[PDB]
Design a protein around this nucleic acid. Structure first.
Ligand SMILES: [Mg+2]
Ligand SMILES: [Mg+2]
Ligand SMILES: [Mg+2]
Ligand SMILES: [Mg+2]
Ligand SMILES: [Mg+2]
Ligand SMILES: [Mg+2]
Ligand SMILES: [Mg+2]
Ligand SMILES: [Mg+2]
Ligand SMILES: [Mg+2]
Ligand SMILES: [Mg+2]
Ligand SMILES: [Mg+2]
Ligand SMILES: [Mg+2]
Ligand SMILES: [Mg+2]
Ligand SMILES: [Mg+2]
Ligand SMILES: [Mg+2]
Ligand SMILES: [Mg+2]
Ligand SMILES: [Mg+2]
Ligand SMILES: [Mg+2]
Ligand SMILES: [Mg+2]
Ligand SMILES: [Mg+2]
Ligand SMILES: [Mg+2]
Ligand SMILES: [Mg+2]
Ligand SMILES: [Mg+2]
Ligand SMILES: [Mg+2]
Ligand SMILES: [Mg+2]
Ligand SMILES: [Mg+2]
Ligand SMILES: [Mg+2]
Ligand SMILES: [Mg+2]
Ligand SMILES: [Mg+2]
Ligand SMILES: [Mg+2]
Ligand SMILES: [Mg+2]
Ligand SMILES: [Mg+2]
Ligand SMILES: [Mg+2]
Ligand SMILES: [Mg+2]
Ligand SMILES: [Mg+2]
Ligand SMILES: [Mg+2]
Ligand SMILES: [Mg+2]
Ligand SMILES: [Mg+2]
Ligand SMILES: [Mg+2]
Ligand SMILES: [Mg+2]
Ligand SMILES: [Mg+2]
Ligand SMILES: [Mg+2]
Ligand SMILES: [Mg+2]
Ligand SMILES: [Zn+2]
Lengths: 138, 237, 208, 151
RNA sequence: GCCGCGGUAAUACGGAGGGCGCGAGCGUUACCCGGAUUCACUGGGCGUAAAGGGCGUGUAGGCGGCCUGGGGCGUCCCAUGUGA
RNA sequence: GGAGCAAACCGGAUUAGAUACCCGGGUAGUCCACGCCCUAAACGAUGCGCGCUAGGUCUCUGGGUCUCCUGGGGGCCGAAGCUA
RNA sequence: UUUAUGUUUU
């Protein structure tokens, strides 16, 4: 069913990273890859590879975590601590170029879809465009 | 020399717990048959290898290992193998706090020395017929839980646990203190909180005597002069 | 307008000599020499661990009392400092210093901040050649402060100009003692001015 | 070297036949203003005694406070229980804006310039525990990249 | 003003001495915003705190899977007019 | 339509009183047809659809190359996470 | 199988 294909993805990722899983399968779309790209290019994921489950197209996403820690709760930090949908189907969110977000003072990325393609808070400010604002990650 | 083959690992060192598992134990598990999960012994190598690397490095800088198992299987194979190393150990019940509270539980060690002197001495017979039996009985059990803990009046940089689940207390006790934790862990528990992992049967004495035995050897070698086989087979099968 | 009546209750109260005085607060009394405790029936009783607000209040009042300024004005200047680009602690301190009545003290044409007040409102002062009687008046870099023409007599002036020799005036200030006059050279940088105050708190006060 | 300011002393009471037996508890902060802070909650039968373990426990739990020039690296929001603290960095020359609890902690840790608000439950005990966790979770441009590279 | 003070030792009432805050002003009353993420777009909720419709079927409305073109309505960019 | 039961009502007890509790009676109603009423602790006090996040065990019911696996239900205990 | 109740403020 899946009213939001994109949000569904970022949640499958969020949920795996929580359980520390090597990868997760996230049914495939062009625009979902273009976003899945920027996640490796900026280093939140090792990367993806197109694959097949039951003759059905998927994207396997390979998950990055931090080093084993010490003290109790000997569990890795997160490469993606935070991922959530900004503009969704229920309320769509478009920002002009002067209006683009600051995410985490610059410590993090804001993925945003524009006429020049899927760009990031910087890339878009550099091209000087803006567009629909997919989500935010740190 | 040090190592172990995968041949002597066959006494029965693969699997104990069937269906009783702790699924975080996936990586080290091979296949299920006849009940019990059979635990992969090739990884047990890659680990026993990397594990020993921390033990060998530790022993030759003069640091300590603290020995724990309370089971029926792992009891007598601790006392022996532990004294032969010269390391501390816990045989009977593991007193709560023994690490996060070393301070107050060790004040109970001093009382053990205070009881040893005064056994026969220029004091005792002057204390009435009641008190003697009393004090010596306080010595009896005192020596029981605290026999092997008596050594090492400072706290170690490692512990060695037979079943990481059977004392969960300990593993977390040390973990709270930054004290590294190494143990022999079957399907019972999760790799997770154990820092240096010995993925094999933690029951079936043949396995705990074999893996602890030649693991005590590796400690003497970084000290000096690894010695002839120490008591292992007693009532064994 | 400005506060009047007993000063030494303030020298004390605050618990640090602020020299609202003439040569006296220098003598072996600021009154704070004899009795280093707050005024009234209760001064000698054992103090209470003060409220976090109580500390910010006392600090603000200290600084404010030092310049002999009415709260009406004292806050005008704090809002100014805030609206102005800067570190907002020091811009406040500079703006205070830049008062005619404060300068005419710092330059020693008169001994007390209060003596330096009546001095201006009585016509005994001049800025850039002009008669100026308003104690609230600003001075920016470059201005020439001087005693007036008809005013160079009156033992009060030259009794206090004499005693100036041997004291080194402030880096932001300069004084030619023979010609009775000075120039406001620059804004009196934080370190340039050590008051007893922690100016931080004076800000943390007005944020309610 | 270390500084002790304490935000909370309070008397609780339990009940037994014939009266309310009291006991005391204390929130204490511990830090050098170089970026090292800690917090612990002591409880014992009298105020001074409980202020003691306050300090004791305080040093047993501490954190890096990766200042950049007296502010923090980035805006952070964290929730402990029902209580929530919003931490945003301000350019030097501002002030430290917070309530008693989030100030004492933040101010012993360095941090001359910061902006904050307490939301949800303003309970001081649970607001303090949420303020440490929102410092503890801070990260700089460095540990950011040491995180995501590969290798 | 809210919690509350006064029942023969009242820092809570009344006067006094003393102190704190402002000062040609200081208080009171009324009203607006603020604190109130307490109508929550930013920024809330609904097992037991106030809050899931007694359950269905379904009109409008709202939302909507994968691939590729066309238009460019939203959106975005630049320029310019106006924005007294 | 009416056997048993039973608001109301009558009687016996109880009690200071007993318009109740206990006992003996007892009429609507309980049942049927048709037509109304539209409430409820109508409760999992938990709206519906979809995807995603360890397992253990008991049970109902299909399919299986029927020591196990697989699907849809009903229960307990529990990972991560949530919760005052 | 008989019981019901306990003035106001501290
Ligand atoms: Mg400014
Ligand atoms: Mg304000
Ligand atoms: Mg909440
Ligand atoms: Mg609240
Ligand atoms: Mg409150
Ligand atoms: Mg009287
Ligand atoms: Mg009286
Ligand atoms: Mg009285
Ligand atoms: Mg009053
Ligand atoms: Mg009075
Ligand atoms: Mg008076
Ligand atoms: Mg008076
Ligand atoms: Mg008014
Ligand atoms: Mg909302
Ligand atoms: Mg609410
Ligand atoms: Mg809901
Ligand atoms: Mg309710
Ligand atoms: Mg319902
Ligand atoms: Mg409905
Ligand atoms: Mg209805
Ligand atoms: Mg429907
Ligand atoms: Mg429709
Ligand atoms: Mg579509
Ligand atoms: Mg549509
Ligand atoms: Mg199209
Ligand atoms: Mg224009
Ligand atoms: Mg009757
Ligand atoms: Mg009767
Ligand atoms: Mg009667
Ligand atoms: Mg009754
Ligand atoms: Mg009857
Ligand atoms: Mg009947
Ligand atoms: Mg009727
Ligand atoms: Mg309801
Ligand atoms: Mg449901
Ligand atoms: Mg519904
Ligand atoms: Mg079926
Ligand atoms: Mg069958
Ligand atoms: Mg089921
Ligand atoms: Mg449960
Ligand atoms: Mg849990
Ligand atoms: Mg009555
Ligand atoms: Mg009563
Ligand atoms: Zn004085």
């Amino acid at each position: 069913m899946l009213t939001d294909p994109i949000a569904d993805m970022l949640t499958r990722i969020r949920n795996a990273t929580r359980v520390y899983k090597e990868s997760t399968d996230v049914p495939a779309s062009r625009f979902k890859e273009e976003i899945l790209r920027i996640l490796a290019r900026e280093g939140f994921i090792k990367g993806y590879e197109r694959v097949d489950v039951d003759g059905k197209p998927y994207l396997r996403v390979y998950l990055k975590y931090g080093p084993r820690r010490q003290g109790p709760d000997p569990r890795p930090e997160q490469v993606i601590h935070h991922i959530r949908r900004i503009s969704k189907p229920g309320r769509r969110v478009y920002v002009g170029v002067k209006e683009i977000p600051r995410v985490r003072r610059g410590l993090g990325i804001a993925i945003l879809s524009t006429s020049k393609g899927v760009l990031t808070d910087r890339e878009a400010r550099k091209l000087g465009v803006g567009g629909e604002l997919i989500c935010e990650v740190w | 020399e040090i190592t172990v083959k995968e041949l002597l690992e066959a006494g029965v060192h693969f699997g104990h717990e069937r269906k009783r598992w702790n699924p975080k134990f996936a990586r080290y598990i091979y296949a299920e048959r006849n009940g019990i999960h059979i635990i992969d012994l090739q990884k047990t190598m890659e680990e026993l290898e990397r594990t020993f690397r921390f033990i060998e490095d530790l022993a030759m800088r003069g640091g300590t290992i603290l020995f724990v198992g309370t089971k029926k299987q792992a009891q007598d194979i601790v006392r022996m193998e532990a004294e032969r190393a010269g390391m501390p150990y816990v045989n009977q019940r593991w007193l709560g706090g023994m690490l996060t509270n070393f301070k107050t539980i060790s004040q109970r060690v001093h009382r053990l020395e205070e009881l040893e002197a005064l056994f026969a001495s220029p004091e005792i017979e002057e204390r009435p017929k009641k008190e003697q039996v009393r004090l010596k009985h306080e010595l009896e059990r005192l020596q029981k839980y605290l026999s092997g803990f008596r050594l090492l009046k400072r706290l170690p940089d490692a512990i060695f646990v037979v079943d990481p689940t059977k004392e969960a207390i300990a593993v977390r006790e040390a973990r709270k203190l930054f004290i590294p934790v190494i143990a022999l862990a079957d399907t019972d528990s999760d790799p997770d909180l154990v820092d240096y992992i010995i993925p094999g049967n933690d029951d079936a004495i043949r396995s705990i005597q074999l893996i602890l035995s030649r693991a005590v050897d590796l400690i003497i070698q970084a000290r000096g002069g690894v010695v002839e086989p120490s008591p292992s087979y007693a009532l064994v099968q | 307008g400005r506060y009047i009546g007993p000063v030494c209750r303030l020298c004390r109260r605050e618990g640090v000599k602020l020299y609202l005085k003439g040569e006296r607060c220098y003598s072996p009394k600021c009154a704070m020499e004899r009795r280093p405790y707050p005024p009234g029936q209760h001064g000698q009783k054992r103090a209470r661990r003060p409220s976090d607000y109580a500390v910010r209040l006392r600090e603000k009042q200290k600084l404010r009392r030092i310049y002999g300024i009415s709260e009406r004005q004292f806050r005008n200047l704090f809002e100014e400092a805030s609206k102005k680009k800067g570190v907002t602690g020091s811009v406040f301190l500079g703006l205070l210093e830049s008062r005619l009545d404060n300068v005419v003290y710092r330059l020693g044409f008169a001994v007390s901040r209060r003596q330096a007040r009546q001095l201006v409102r009585h016509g005994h002062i001049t800025v850039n050649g002009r008669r100026v009687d308003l104690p609230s008046y600003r001075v920016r870099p470059g201005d020439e402060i001087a005693v007036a023409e008809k005013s160079r007599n009156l033992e009060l002036i030259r009794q206090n100009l004499e005693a100036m020799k041997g004291r080194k005036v402030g880096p932001w200030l300069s004084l030619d003692v023979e010609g009775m006059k000075g120039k406001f050279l620059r804004l009196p940088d934080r370190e340039d001015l050590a008051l007893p105050v922690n100016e931080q708190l004076v800000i943390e006060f007005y944020s309610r | 070297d270390f500084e002790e300011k304490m935000i909370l002393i309070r008397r609780t009471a339990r009940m037994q036949a014939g009266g309310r037996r009291f006991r005391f508890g204390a929130l204490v902060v511990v830090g050098d203003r170089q970026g090292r802070v800690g917090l612990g909650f002591g409880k014992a039968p009298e105020v001074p005694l409980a202020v003691q373990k306050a300090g004791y426990y305080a040093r047993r739990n501490m954190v890096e406070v990766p200042l950049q020039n007296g502010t923090i690296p980035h805006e952070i929001e964290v929730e402990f229980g029902a209580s929530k603290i919003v931490l945003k960095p301000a350019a030097p020359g501002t002030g430290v804006i917070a309530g008693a609890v989030p100030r004492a902690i933040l101010e012993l840790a360095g941090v001359t310039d910061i902006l904050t608000k307490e939301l949800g439950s303003r309970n001081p005990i649970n607001i303090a525990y949420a303020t440490m966790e929102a410092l503890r979770q801070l990260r700089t441009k460095a540990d950011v990249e040491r995180l995501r590279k590969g290798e």
